[PDB]
């Protein structure tokens, strides 16, 4: 199955009491693996299997880089606010990551948001930056003047990020690469006369599930989001109404297994 490594950075100018001006969290797939912030000024594991497999040298070195990234991030944000002539608190976000697909293929990405809206998206193949407005297009011209920076990123996305993903996937193989199959049951009268059919799944991992209704697809399937159960499994459902005598059935696909409940 596709696996991913993602690092997020959140920066907040003029934060409230308590609210850190900087947070940086790392995820493999939907599991968090690492945390840093302007309060703890320390990089910590958010999974025991990271904690067990990376020596103190690791947390020591990356604490220091993150204290650095915190500094750089306060300045990039303070500058953007000058550029827009924005007073008061605003936010700056960065997400970087790579997918290792099953075909053995790879993807890499890096983007920034200002106030939760897309600002700069990197293209590692054309070594260029897509910008949304004037102030963004200005930051692009600077970043593209630096051939060596653009090449550093492309190499990091394509080589480093995938090497990290691979050893993280090993450190946490029992958590990240297990399958817990889903419980799939179908329970049924949505108003007097009309009947709905609910296809429900729970206790499953990984969270990627396909669920639909068919006849022997079907139009107007009400789908429910994949939600976390709190035990590290997920749950999800699909509902559907019945013209008051066609033969219907719920189809579910998870982690290589296909199910039909008539």
């Amino acid at each position, epitope marked *: 199955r596709t696996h991913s490594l993602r690092y997020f950075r959140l920066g907040v100018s003029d934060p409230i009491h308590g609210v850190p001006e900087f947070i940086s969290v790392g995820y493999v797939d939907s599991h968090p693996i690492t945390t840093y912030d302007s309060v703890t000024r320390q990089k910590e594991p958010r999974a025991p299997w990271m904690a067990e497999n990376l020596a103190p040298d690791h947390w020591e*070195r990356y604490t*220091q880089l993150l204290r*650095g990234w915190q500094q750089m991030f306060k300045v990039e944000l303070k500058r953007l606010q000058r550029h827009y002539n924005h007073s008061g608190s605003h936010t700056y976000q960065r997400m970087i990551g790579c997918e290792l697909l099953e075909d053995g293929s790879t993807t890499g990405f890096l983007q920034y948001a200002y106030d939760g809206q897309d600002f700069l998206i990197f293209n590692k193949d054309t070594l260029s930056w897509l910008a949304v407005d004037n102030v963004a297009h200005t930051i692009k011209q600077a970043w593209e003047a630096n051939q*060596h920076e653009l090449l550093y990123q*492309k190499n990091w996305l394509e080589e480093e990020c995938i090497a990290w993903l691979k050893r993280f996937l090993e450190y946490g193989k029992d958590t990240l690469q297990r399958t817990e199959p889903p419980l799939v049951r179908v329970n049924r009268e949505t108003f007097p006369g009309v009947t709905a059919l609910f296809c429900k799944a729970h206790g499953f991992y990984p969270p990627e599930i396909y669920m639909t209704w068919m006849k022997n697809i079907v139009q107007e399937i009400d789908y429910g989001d994949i939600l976390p159960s709190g035990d590290g499994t997920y749950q999800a459902w699909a509902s559907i109404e019945l013209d008051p005598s066609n033969l219907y059935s719920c189809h579910v696909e998870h982690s290589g297994v296909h199910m039909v409940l008539q």
Partner: antibody, heavy 108, light 112 residues
Framework: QNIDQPTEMTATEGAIVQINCTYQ??????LFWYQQHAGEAPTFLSY??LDGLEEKGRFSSFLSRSKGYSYLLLKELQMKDSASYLC??????????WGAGTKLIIKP | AGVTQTPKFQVLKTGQSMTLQCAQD?????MYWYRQDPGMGLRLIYY???????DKGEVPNGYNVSRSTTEDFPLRLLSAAPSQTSVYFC???????????FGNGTRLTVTE
């Protein structure tokens, strides 16, 4: 986490010298060459991180990520190219690992 | 502009204390202290990813640093030893991955 470059190299004024640099690492964030004149501060020459060649004038830098190999190529040598040439790479942790340096002697 | 390092030369008696200054006007986030010695690469003593943080390099023993400001990264020799006879270079870089700008060095000799 080792790096090798030759101690000393000597070449005739007007000719060509290729300074080799090899490096074993599990992780790479780029290779640098710095120039250091006797009694002076090392100064930035070249950054390579993808495979291939870069050229700024009489100076070229090549990198093979796979072969873990770099060369600094100096054409049309001048007496002023007498200096130490330092190679360095960033590892996975962004630690800058320095070679022992190559002293380039130019014969007039 | 660049990195200014003082002094260029110092002799110390064994056990004396010594502050090497080093400053940059370039807004660099990283500053570094290296010693250069015949037959080996530069060896990192300490470094600093930003004002308010510092960390050991490969040869921290015998040295301390401070980074109260972006500008300044002083290196203090605590108790001077013969083995510290060396040439000291402090450097700055915009980022963990950008080119180092070096100062013009300190030639330092410790005699009993």
């Amino acid at each position: 986490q080792n790096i090798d470059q030759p101690t000393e190299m000597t070449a005739t004024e007007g000719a060509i010298v290729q300074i080799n640099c090899t490096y074993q690492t599990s992780g790479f964030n780029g290779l640098f060459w710095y120039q250091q004149h006797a009694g002076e501060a090392p100064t930035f020459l070249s950054y390579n991180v993808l495979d291939g060649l870069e050229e700024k004038g009489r100076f070229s830098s090549f990198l093979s990520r796979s072969k873990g190999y770099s060369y600094l190529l100096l054409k049309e040598l001048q007496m002023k190219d007498s200096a130490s040439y330092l190679c360095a790479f960033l590892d996975s942790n962004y630690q800058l690992i320095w070679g022992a340096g190559t002293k380039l002697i130019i014969k007039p | 502009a660049g990195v200014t390092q003082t002094p260029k030369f110092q002799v110390l008696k064994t056990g004396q204390s010594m502050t090497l200054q080093c400053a940059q006007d370039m807004n660099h986030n990283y500053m570094y202290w290296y010693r250069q010695d015949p037959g080996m690469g530069l060896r990192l003593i300490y470094y600093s990813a930003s004002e308010g943080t510092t960390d050991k390099g490969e040869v921290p023993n015998g040295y301390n640093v401070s980074r109260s400001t972006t500008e300044d990264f002083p290196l203090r020799l605590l108790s001077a030893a013969p083995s510290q006879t060396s040439v000291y270079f402090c450097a700055s870089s915009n980022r963990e991955y950008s080119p180092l700008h070096f100062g013009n060095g300190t030639r330092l000799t410790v005699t009993e």
